[PDB]
Amino acid sequence: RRQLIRQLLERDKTPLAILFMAAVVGTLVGLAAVAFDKGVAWLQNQRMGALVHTADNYPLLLTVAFLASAVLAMFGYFLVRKYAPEAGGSGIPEIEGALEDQRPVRWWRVLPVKFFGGLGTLGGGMVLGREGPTVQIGGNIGRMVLDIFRLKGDEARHTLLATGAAAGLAAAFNAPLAGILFIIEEMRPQFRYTLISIKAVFIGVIMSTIMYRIFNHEVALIDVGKLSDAPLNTLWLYLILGIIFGIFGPIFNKWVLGMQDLLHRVHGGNITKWVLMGGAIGGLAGLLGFVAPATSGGGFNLIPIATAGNFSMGMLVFIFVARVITTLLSFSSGAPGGIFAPMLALGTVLGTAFGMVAVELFPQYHLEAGTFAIAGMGALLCASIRAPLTGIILVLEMTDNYQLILPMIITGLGCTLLAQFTGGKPLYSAILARTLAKQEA
Amino acid sequence: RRRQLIRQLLERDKTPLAILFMAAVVGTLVGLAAVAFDKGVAWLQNQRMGALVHTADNYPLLLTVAFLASAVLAMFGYFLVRKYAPEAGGSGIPEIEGALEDQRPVRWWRVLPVKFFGGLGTLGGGMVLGREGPTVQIGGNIGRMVLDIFRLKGDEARHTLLATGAAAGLAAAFNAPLAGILFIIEEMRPQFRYTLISIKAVFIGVIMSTIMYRIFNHEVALIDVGKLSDAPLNTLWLYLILGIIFGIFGPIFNKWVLGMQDLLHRVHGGNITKWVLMGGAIGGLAGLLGFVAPATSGGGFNLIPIATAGNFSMGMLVFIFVARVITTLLSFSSGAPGGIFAPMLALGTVLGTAFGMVAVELFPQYHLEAGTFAIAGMGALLCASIRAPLTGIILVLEMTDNYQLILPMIITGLGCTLLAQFTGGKPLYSAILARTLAKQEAEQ
Ligand SMILES: [Cl-]
Ligand SMILES: [Cl-]
Ligand SMILES: [Cl-]
Ligand SMILES: [Cl-]
């Protein structure tokens, strides 16, 4: 008992050496995430350029949309497979295992590989998110300054690695709260005690968010406007949407994990067949990035359109099915990019589809289709990655509609419930469990 | 250990169906309890102010009935605690925190009817207390109650239902579902070792309680401020300075509230009769102040939309601040059933606003609005005293609905916390538990 008394009067006393270093972590992470975010936008801008210069002859621009995206893809697939295998896919599970001290943090390799490799894939128009890169890069950035200044201890090592990935998430969504919550719900060891200073996480999370605020202010990622409020006699509709998401989540997990195996056979582990395969996929998303931009890309461009209900009931189903295919194909192929963002784009489409049904069935509720989208925006995350608390806050920090707080929680929970009862698994813990077992075998 | 991790990773987030349902009934109960308590308090504040009209002529008699009616209810609160549940004294949060560490007993058969009715008299009397203390501790005991009744077993089922009630309690006391959950995973849970708290189950009970609050309390938010202006980048450095001021006042406030507990303990010396009568004084003082200067009594929720707007004078804010400091300590450090959580939101909102007004005249080029600094300083005294910034920032984010000030709310809440450490300040809830848990050993 006396241990606790001694512990209580010493709580929240993180050494100054850690707190100051966390600041320079988030600083670098932000700048890197800023530079990364601009690079893709630049590489996307140039692919857009050659299309105008070759506006005539339909099969020409379709071809040059393929190649430029295919080449950039292969440029990324190779940068990974040669110098840093660990920087393939998201990187979140890699950082997760790194906090459990079950995986290494080779920053000298990860930092240049994940960055430029991300530039190639993301810039090609592939269906990936800035998360994966920024999350892993951030952790390595924080690990880098740990090695350089030669700090010592379990606390100093686990903290700077946490703040690094935290600042990476924030600078990828301008959502500071979403980053910090992600560490204490998904990233930190969910089974044993750790010496992670939440206070230090804040500092790093702030600086990167500040760094993002410096170069992108007054221009939000997603603007949806103020959506209608939600009555109490409507909440039961949001529970159903959760249940639907609750049984589709695990299925998506089977697909994202299964496709990683099926696509693996195509190359068998060979660097050349793999790269060539990525050129087909990378070239595909660039081709689709012309004939149907809704079926490719991060998916952030369709959310405000979908939530506004500007899409049709048929178009949504098309967009949904098509994106599901391209989402798997891109991420499951081991390409350096986040699955975090495209799952935000999926549910927004699925939720809107649910809304347009609820609108015509129950006209008495005076329903706006968009509310089911914002509720269903982070409804796949609460099913796949199994971190509902981080999902809601993140969505809240990008949609700015707190008036739908109870719908968002109900759906996200009715989802997370069924995603347990239907035998689902945390897609980030599952991937880590896959590698950690493939190592001792 | 790797092969042990892989085992756990594939078995992650598989909370038993039993707890998940029992968490639902906890929040359902904690909500219904929190609603009744809230409606009970308001009814008492409604009757006493209905007696100041029946005697609105004889000014001396008016100042007499505003004292006695609040003194009887105060004494009725102090007595119910000092006699049947001494643990129901103070806030109640440190008791639940100690319970999750398995160092304190959760006597729900005593606290539940004591904390509810005891705080009812004090809060309904107009003392500077909050609905937090009652609803949280009551909620925890409510969770503990259904734990003993249905004979649930395990370290997971025990710590969870106690946390769900604690979370469903805070949520129903602010209509802030996200706040109650974060409060459990940042301040309430054991901060030093692993704990089997089903966050998913916390999520369930919180909903049900918040839902129950929605059933009764609709169309009227606890705090309506309105859409404030934005916050430019060149404005951010100011909020940091605001944070530093909070970071050095909180620890001082902690020494006061803790010290005032020791000083007021010399008047009664533990004597039940003296202590109760000491409650009639402060309660009577509060009820009196509730009529001659309302901004010196009550919770303080009413003067938040006002101060944030700017309808108060700088001279008034200085008055309200000091007066509330004196009335809060006097009414909380006395051991009355009630929290210091809510009155520290008012203290911050005022101090925040007063910093805003100064900031405006000194920097008109920024085109400031003193309401920003008010909201940016609302959940700031919590940041310094309680050392639960992630809870405050979100809590304020829920009641004020101003996310465009998330950077200032955080930046202030950082310098607040950073300076709450660099001055030797301790978490107010932890320092209190560390007293009771040490006094429990000091007398053997
Ligand atoms: Cl991965
Ligand atoms: Cl990802
Ligand atoms: Cl207390
Ligand atoms: Cl309190």
Side-chain angles (χ1 to χ4, degrees):
Chain A
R1 175 179 300 187
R2 189 62 178 182
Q3 177 211 21
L4 191 59
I5 304 181
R6 175 59 184 182
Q7 281 183 321
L8 294 184
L9 302 182
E10 290 288 79
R11 181 193 162 191
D12 202 32
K13 297 189 61 177
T14 302
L16 195 148
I18 306 177
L19 294 184
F20 181 80
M21 285 302 172
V24 81
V25 169
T27 303
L28 295 174
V29 172
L31 295 174
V34 161
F36 178 87
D37 184 28
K38 291 289 173 291
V40 181
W42 189 93
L43 293 170
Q44 283 175 321
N45 175 258
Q46 304 305 324
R47 296 193 310 106
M48 215 65 54
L51 296 173
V52 183
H53 296 193
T54 61
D56 46 331
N57 190 232
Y58 199 64
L60 175 59
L61 43 76
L62 296 188
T63 309
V64 309
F66 187 95
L67 302 180
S69 296
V71 170
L72 285 178
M74 294 185 295
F75 172 68
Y77 275 85
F78 174 74
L79 257 292
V80 175
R81 288 281 82 199
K82 176 74 175 188
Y83 310 94
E86 49 174 345
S90 185
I92 300 180
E94 214 60 39
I95 306 298
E96 278 200 14
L99 292 171
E100 290 270 9
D101 298 277
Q102 290 302 322
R103 293 294 291 183
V105 192
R106 316 209 306 264
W107 57 269
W108 50 91
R109 286 180 170 275
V110 171
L111 294 179
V113 163
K114 198 64 177 182
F115 189 95
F116 292 90
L119 260 52
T121 47
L122 279 297
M126 300 180 61
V127 191
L128 294 171
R130 289 168 170 80
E131 313 79 66
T134 53
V135 170
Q136 188 180 22
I137 287 181
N140 295 259
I141 287 287
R143 169 68 194 193
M144 172 176 62
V145 303
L146 178 74
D147 288 10
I148 290 186
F149 296 89
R150 309 169 187 179
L151 296 181
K152 179 180 180 177
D154 286 326
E155 190 180 9
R157 190 177 78 263
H158 293 155
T159 295
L160 300 195
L161 188 52
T163 73
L169 184 63
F173 293 118
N174 200 0
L177 295 180
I180 314 182
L181 257 305
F182 194 57
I183 265 56
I184 67 179
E185 193 201 6
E186 181 69 17
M187 302 290 282
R188 79 173 238 269
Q190 212 82 19
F191 304 100
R192 81 167 178 277
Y193 184 79
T194 336
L195 295 84
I196 308 177
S197 178
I198 308 180
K199 182 184 308 178
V201 177
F202 253 88
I203 307 182
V205 161
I206 294 179
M207 299 302 297
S208 65
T209 310
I210 291 184
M211 289 304 166
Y212 182 89
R213 280 294 224 279
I214 293 183
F215 303 87
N216 300 271
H217 46 214
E218 309 301 324
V219 189
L221 294 178
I222 305 179
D223 195 334
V224 205
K226 182 65 67 176
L227 271 296
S228 173
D229 292 29
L232 294 196
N233 67 341
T234 303
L235 296 181
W236 72 274
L237 286 181
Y238 292 99
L239 178 60
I240 290 184
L241 182 63
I243 296 183
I244 289 186
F245 270 99
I247 70 181
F248 174 81
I251 295 188
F252 197 77
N253 281 14
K254 297 178 183 177
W255 295 359
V256 69
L257 293 180
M259 199 65 54
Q260 279 191 328
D261 302 336
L262 191 147
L263 287 177
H264 182 87
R265 301 174 183 171
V266 191
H267 52 62
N270 164 268
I271 189 181
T272 307
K273 299 173 185 178
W274 201 329
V275 156
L276 281 188
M277 190 185 66
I281 303 178
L284 178 66
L287 179 70
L288 291 176
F290 189 90
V291 304
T295 62
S296 182
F300 278 164
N301 289 269
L302 54 85
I303 291 183
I305 308 181
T307 327
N310 286 327
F311 288 149
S312 69
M313 180 54 199
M315 187 63 174
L316 288 177
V317 177
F318 164 76
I319 289 175
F320 181 72
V321 171
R323 288 197 99 269
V324 166
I325 292 183
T326 64
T327 303
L328 298 176
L329 238 59
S330 52
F331 173 73
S332 307
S333 61
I339 196 188
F340 204 98
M343 287 198 290
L344 292 170
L346 288 192
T348 301
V349 172
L350 179 55
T352 305
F354 185 91
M356 296 182 178
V357 176
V359 167
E360 78 179 28
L361 286 185
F362 313 90
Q364 66 250 42
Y365 294 168
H366 298 75
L367 288 178
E368 186 169 6
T371 58
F372 292 92
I374 306 184
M377 181 177 178
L380 239 184
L381 301 184
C382 85
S384 300
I385 83 175
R386 298 285 283 270
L389 188 54
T390 303
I392 300 179
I393 291 186
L394 170 70
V395 169
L396 176 61
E397 292 191 279
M398 295 195 304
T399 53
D400 205 342
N401 284 249
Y402 177 79
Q403 27 106 15
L404 293 169
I405 182 59
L406 219 62
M408 290 194 303
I409 296 182
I410 287 183
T411 293
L413 199 62
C415 135
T416 311
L417 267 185
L418 276 305
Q420 165 182 341
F421 293 148
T422 54
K425 293 177 181 176
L427 202 268
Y428 284 155
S429 291
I431 288 182
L432 182 61
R434 284 263 237 79
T435 296
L436 254 50
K438 195 177 181 179
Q439 187 179 29
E440 71 163 355
Chain B
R1 49 163 294 195
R2 171 197 301 177
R3 192 155 54 254
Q4 184 184 12
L5 180 58
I6 306 175
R7 168 60 198 176
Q8 295 170 327
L9 289 178
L10 296 174
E11 292 287 322
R12 181 186 172 196
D13 195 38
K14 291 179 60 181
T15 309
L17 187 144
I19 303 172
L20 296 183
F21 183 85
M22 295 303 171
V25 76
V26 165
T28 310
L29 288 186
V30 178
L32 294 183
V35 168
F37 173 85
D38 181 33
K39 279 297 169 295
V41 171
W43 183 75
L44 293 182
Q45 290 181 334
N46 173 264
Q47 297 302 317
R48 300 187 308 101
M49 200 178 183
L52 306 182
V53 180
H54 182 62
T55 70
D57 42 336
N58 198 9
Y59 183 82
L61 184 61
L62 204 170
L63 300 194
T64 310
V65 287
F67 186 95
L68 296 177
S70 301
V72 171
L73 299 185
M75 288 185 296
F76 172 71
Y78 279 75
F79 175 76
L80 260 293
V81 172
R82 290 284 85 196
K83 170 72 174 183
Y84 307 102
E87 51 183 358
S91 181
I93 295 183
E95 199 69 33
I96 308 298
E97 282 200 13
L100 292 166
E101 290 274 5
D102 294 320
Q103 293 294 337
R104 299 293 292 183
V106 196
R107 305 203 302 269
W108 57 271
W109 53 97
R110 284 185 165 275
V111 183
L112 287 179
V114 163
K115 196 76 178 192
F116 181 82
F117 288 110
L120 204 55
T122 64
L123 274 296
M127 303 188 63
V128 199
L129 304 179
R131 290 159 167 78
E132 311 78 70
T135 54
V136 170
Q137 185 180 13
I138 284 180
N141 294 262
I142 289 293
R144 171 69 192 200
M145 177 175 64
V146 313
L147 171 69
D148 297 24
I149 287 187
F150 298 90
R151 295 300 182 183
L152 290 162
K153 183 183 175 181
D155 279 332
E156 189 180 33
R158 191 173 79 262
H159 291 184
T160 294
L161 298 191
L162 182 55
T164 61
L170 187 70
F174 289 111
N175 196 11
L178 300 186
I181 311 173
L182 264 295
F183 185 54
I184 257 57
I185 69 174
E186 186 189 17
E187 177 65 22
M188 297 292 280
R189 67 171 274 240
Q191 206 84 5
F192 310 98
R193 70 178 194 274
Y194 182 78
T195 320
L196 289 83
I197 300 184
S198 173
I199 305 182
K200 179 182 305 179
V202 178
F203 238 79
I204 306 182
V206 160
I207 295 187
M208 308 307 298
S209 68
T210 305
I211 283 187
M212 292 306 156
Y213 180 87
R214 290 292 216 279
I215 305 296
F216 296 85
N217 305 271
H218 34 43
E219 296 178 334
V220 181
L222 294 175
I223 293 180
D224 196 338
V225 189
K227 174 57 66 177
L228 267 279
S229 54
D230 290 28
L233 296 181
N234 71 338
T235 314
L236 299 188
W237 66 279
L238 288 176
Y239 298 97
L240 175 54
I241 306 183
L242 174 60
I244 300 179
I245 299 178
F246 271 110
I248 70 178
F249 172 70
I252 297 183
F253 193 92
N254 278 9
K255 293 179 180 176
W256 290 6
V257 58
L258 293 177
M260 187 64 58
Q261 276 182 331
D262 302 334
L263 222 179
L264 287 176
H265 199 60
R266 298 178 178 177
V267 179
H268 43 70
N271 177 268
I272 168 183
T273 297
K274 290 180 178 178
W275 206 329
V276 165
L277 290 179
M278 196 187 74
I282 318 173
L285 170 62
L288 179 69
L289 277 179
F291 184 82
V292 315
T296 66
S297 169
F301 269 162
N302 312 23
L303 60 91
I304 295 187
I306 300 180
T308 320
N311 300 336
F312 278 158
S313 73
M314 177 61 182
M316 190 68 176
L317 294 183
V318 171
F319 170 75
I320 299 178
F321 183 81
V322 173
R324 284 200 134 272
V325 166
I326 299 179
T327 55
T328 302
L329 300 175
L330 205 67
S331 47
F332 176 79
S333 306
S334 64
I340 198 182
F341 191 88
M344 279 195 299
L345 290 176
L347 285 172
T349 310
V350 171
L351 174 56
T353 307
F355 176 82
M357 295 180 180
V358 176
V360 171
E361 84 166 22
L362 296 186
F363 303 94
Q365 64 274 27
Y366 296 159
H367 301 74
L368 298 184
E369 177 176 0
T372 70
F373 295 89
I375 300 184
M378 180 178 172
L381 235 189
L382 303 180
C383 153
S385 300
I386 309 190
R387 308 292 288 269
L390 195 57
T391 307
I393 298 175
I394 292 187
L395 177 68
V396 177
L397 177 60
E398 297 197 66
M399 293 185 296
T400 61
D401 205 335
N402 283 260
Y403 179 77
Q404 21 81 13
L405 295 165
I406 190 61
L407 254 68
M409 283 193 303
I410 289 181
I411 292 177
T412 291
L414 182 79
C416 169
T417 311
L418 289 182
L419 260 296
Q421 171 181 339
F422 296 157
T423 62
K426 304 174 183 177
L428 197 271
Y429 286 158
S430 291
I432 285 185
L433 175 62
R435 288 262 221 82
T436 308
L437 220 56
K439 287 190 61 178
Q440 194 178 55
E441 284 189 354
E443 51 190 18
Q444 277 197 356

